[PDB]
Structures are given as structure tokens and as C-alpha cells.
Design an enzyme around this catalytic site. Structure first.
Site, PDB file in Angstrom:
ATOM      1  CG  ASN A 170      -1.765  -1.287   1.268  1.00 23.14           C
ATOM      2  OD1 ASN A 170      -1.944  -1.836   2.343  1.00 23.14           O
ATOM      3  ND2 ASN A 170      -2.171  -1.796   0.124  1.00 23.14           N
ATOM      4  CG  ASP A 178      -0.988   3.174   3.664  1.00 27.46           C
ATOM      5  OD1 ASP A 178      -0.242   2.185   3.612  1.00 27.46           O
ATOM      6  OD2 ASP A 178      -2.216   3.137   3.880  1.00 27.46           O
ATOM      7  CG  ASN A 215      -4.831  -2.812   6.383  1.00 28.10           C
ATOM      8  OD1 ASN A 215      -4.462  -2.435   7.488  1.00 28.10           O
ATOM      9  ND2 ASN A 215      -6.063  -2.613   5.922  1.00 28.10           N
TER      10      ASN A 215
END
Length: 129
Positions: free
Chosen positions: A46, A48, A59
Site C-alpha cells: 500500500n 502508505d 492490512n
């Protein structure tokens, strides 16, 4: 491990997913298919700093700690490495916590996009359960 469709369906059934929070078993099978193609070693980064792990692409920002994601909340109380195992127990127990959120299975964008609203019973057709 790459699961077969009906092998995964049976393993998921034995772990209590059929009709969990109103979602029939085929939803979970369909989600796994579009998330990971049934591959327990699937990972995706991801943008981020977090990473999605395993058959259900769980996640590291919210759910598991991988030791490299700053501020992971680790709501499932598990190392992310446990989500890469051939045994799906940890992934399923965590998935139940995710699906207990307000938005349910909408937490999985692949499910929303490719599974939701379709006849997901098709995913368990032909399986001996």
C-alpha cells in the site's frame, strides 16, 4: 499454499464462516479468489507504508503487525507472518473481526467490485461440504 476452490470452501466452512454476519460461504470464497487467487503467500504494498497479507489481503495499518509499519494498530493481535501460513485459521479469525466493522465485507474492495450482489452461491457449487 495455493488452495483449490472447494478445498478452501471446506476449510472456511469448518472455521465458522458460512452465514457469519449474514454473509453466505460463497462470499468468502469469492473474496479470497479476487484478493489473492487462493494463494496464502500473496502480498501487496500500500502507498502508505502498509502491506496486505495472505489469502484475504489483510492490512498492517489496522489489523496485524509486520514490524515495519509505523503505528500499526494490530487489532487482530497477530504478527502479519501468521497470515501467510498454509493453515488459514489466523486469517479467518482476523477476517471475522474486520467483517464486524460497520461496513462489513465492503472492507474488501475486490469483494465489493467483483463479488457483491452476484450469485455467490456459484462459488461453492460442486463442493462436498
Amino acid at each position: 499454499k495455493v488452495y483449490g476452490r472447494c478445498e478452501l470452501a471446506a476449510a472456511m466452512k469448518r472455521l465458522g464462516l458460512d452465514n457469519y454476519r449474514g454473509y453466505s460461504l460463497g462470499n468468502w470464497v469469492c473474496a479470497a479468489k479476487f484478493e489473492s487467487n487462493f494463494n496464502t503467500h500473496a502480498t501487496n504494498r500500500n502507498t502508505d507504508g502498509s502491506t496486505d497479507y495472505g489469502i484475504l489481503q489483510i492490512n498492517s495499518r489496522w489489523w496485524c503487525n509486520d514490524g515495519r509499519t509505523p503505528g500499526s494498530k494490530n487489532l487482530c493481535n497477530i504478527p502479519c507472518s501468521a497470515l501467510l501460513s498454509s493453515d488459514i485459521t489466523a486469517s479467518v479469525n482476523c477476517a471475522k473481526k474486520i467483517a464486524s466493522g460497520g461496513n462489513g465485507m465492503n472492507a474488501w474492495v475486490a469483494w465489493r467490485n467483483r463479488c457483491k450482489g452476484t450469485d455467490v452461491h456459484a462459488w461453492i457449487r460442486g463442493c462436498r461440504l
